């Protein structure tokens, strides 16, 4: 899991 | 403190007098938490990872507490795998990345 | 170097031969690059996110220069808005979180 913009 | 990443970074943060697990992230923005009553007017927002976009609430002004240190911003509520500190409230808690 | 992180913790990386921009990102698992090429066998995978899953092609003992400090180890390439570097390589150039 990896994870924002 | 000093963090290594041989785990995933979680700490843990207090808002609205509960406390949470979150994630350290600098890849994110901003910081979004899961489902919540947080006090106040919220407006939209739309945020991006790896699999697209999704529609959240804004809810400025929010004190949170993350790993003793307190911060005062911007905290973003929607469906978030994990809680997660973005670089908004970790400008605030004075960290910075070093190799 | 100590990176602050008022902006996006980007830096140069070299791989593939090919150098490229990347973000330092403590919030991810694994390395994801857009596509690209690279030498090998690779398997498929699922990752996530905001916004839901993608399939990606892992693969496995790749050499990458982050900023300066060669790593190995393994490499997703797919559909991503922005190349990360997560945890699997940051670990292996000694980057910690300092507050
Ligand atoms: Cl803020
Ligand atoms: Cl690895
Ligand atoms: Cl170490
Ligand atoms: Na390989």
């Given at each position: 899991?990896?994870?924002?913009? | 403190?000093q963090?290594?990443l041989?785990?995933?970074?979680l700490?843990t943060?207090?808002?609205?007098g509960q406390?949470?697990?979150?994630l350290?992230?600098?890849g994110?923005?901003?910081?979004?938490?899961?489902?919540?009553?947080?006090p106040?007017?919220?407006?939209p927002?739309?945020?991006?990872?790896?699999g697209?976009?999704?529609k959240?609430?804004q809810?400025?002004?929010?004190?949170i507490?993350?790993?003793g240190h307190?911060?005062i911003?911007?905290?973003?509520?929607?469906?978030?795998?994990?809680?997660?500190?973005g670089?908004?409230?970790?400008?605030?808690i004075g960290?910075?990345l070093?190799?």
């Amino acid at each position: 899991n990896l994870x924002q913009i | 403190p000093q963090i290594t990443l041989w785990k995933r970074p979680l700490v843990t943060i207090k808002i609205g007098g509960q406390l949470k697990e979150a994630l350290l992230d600098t890849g994110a923005d901003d910081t979004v938490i899961e489902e919540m009553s947080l006090p106040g007017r919220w407006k939209p927002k739309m945020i991006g990872g790896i699999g697209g976009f999704v529609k959240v609430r804004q809810y400025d002004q929010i004190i949170i507490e993350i790993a003793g240190h307190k911060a005062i911003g911007t905290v973003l509520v929607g469906p978030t795998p994990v809680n997660i500190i973005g670089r908004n409230l970790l400008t605030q808690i004075g960290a910075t990345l070093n190799f």
